[PDB]
Every structure is written in C-alpha cells, then in structure tokens.
Swiss-Prot record, chain B:
Subunit of the fusion protein that is processed upon entry into the host cell. Mediates fusion of the virion and cellular membranes by functioning as a class I viral fusion protein. Contains a viral fusion peptide that is unmasked after S2 cleavage. This cleavage can occur at the cell membrane by host TMPRSS2 or during endocytosis by host CSTL. In either case, this triggers an extensive and irreversible conformational change that leads to fusion of the viral envelope with the cellular cytoplasmic membrane, releasing viral genomic RNA into the host cell cytoplasm. Residues 22-47 are annotated as: Disordered. The record marks 9-10 as: Cleavage. Residues 29-48 are annotated as: Fusion peptide 2. It comes from the Viruses. This is Spike protein S2'. The gene is S. Residues 10-31 are annotated as: Fusion peptide 1. Disulfide bonds join 34-45.
Length: 49, 48
C-alpha cells in the first residue's frame, strides 16, 4: 500500500544521491510524482495540504 | 494614416486594433507560472 502525498517522503531506492538536475529536460521524480520535464525553482504559493 | 499612431493606421484603424482583445494563440507563450520570457521571440511559444 503506497501513500504518495504532501509532507516529506522517507523511503526511496538504493540509488545515488543527487539533489536535482536543473534547466534540462530530465524524467523528474520528486515525492513519488513522476513525469518528463524541465526543472526550475518554484515561483507559486502552496498550502500545507 | 495618422503618423503619430503606430504604423500606417488612421485614427479609426487605431481604434479598430485597440478595441479587439487578443489573448489567444501566440500571445500566450508560457503557462502555469513557469519561468522565462513571455515577450518578443526570446523564448519558445508553447502555449499551454
């Protein structure tokens, strides 16, 4: 049973740590959400939910 | 033409362009509060 939601993820794979890749088309994968895209720093408001 | 309005536009022509609102294709280049220019030809139009 996999819970992917707000708040930090605590379980990831035995892979090599990196922070992010920026301004490059990569397959992103943050908090279990995946897709193909270009990563830049966020510029919008969020709620804690 | 009124050589004080942009291009070879008459006072009427000025109203004819200014009073039609364009916010369709090619006027939206970026979407979703993504970073990058939303002006000139300096960044790729990818409307939404």
């Amino acid at each position: 049973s996999f819970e992917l939601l707000h708040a930090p993820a605590t379980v990831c794979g035995p892979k090599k740590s990196t922070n992010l890749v920026k301004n490059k088309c990569v397959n992103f994968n943050f908090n279990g959400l995946t897709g193909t895209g270009v990563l830049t720093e966020s510029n919008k408001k969020f709620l804690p939910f | 033409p009124d050589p004080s309005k942009p291009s070879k536009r008459s006072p009427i022509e000025d109203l004819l362009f200014n009073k039609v609102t364009l916010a369709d294709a090619g006027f939206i280049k970026q979407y979703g509060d993504c970073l990058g220019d939303i002006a000139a030809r300096d960044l790729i139009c990818a409307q939404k």
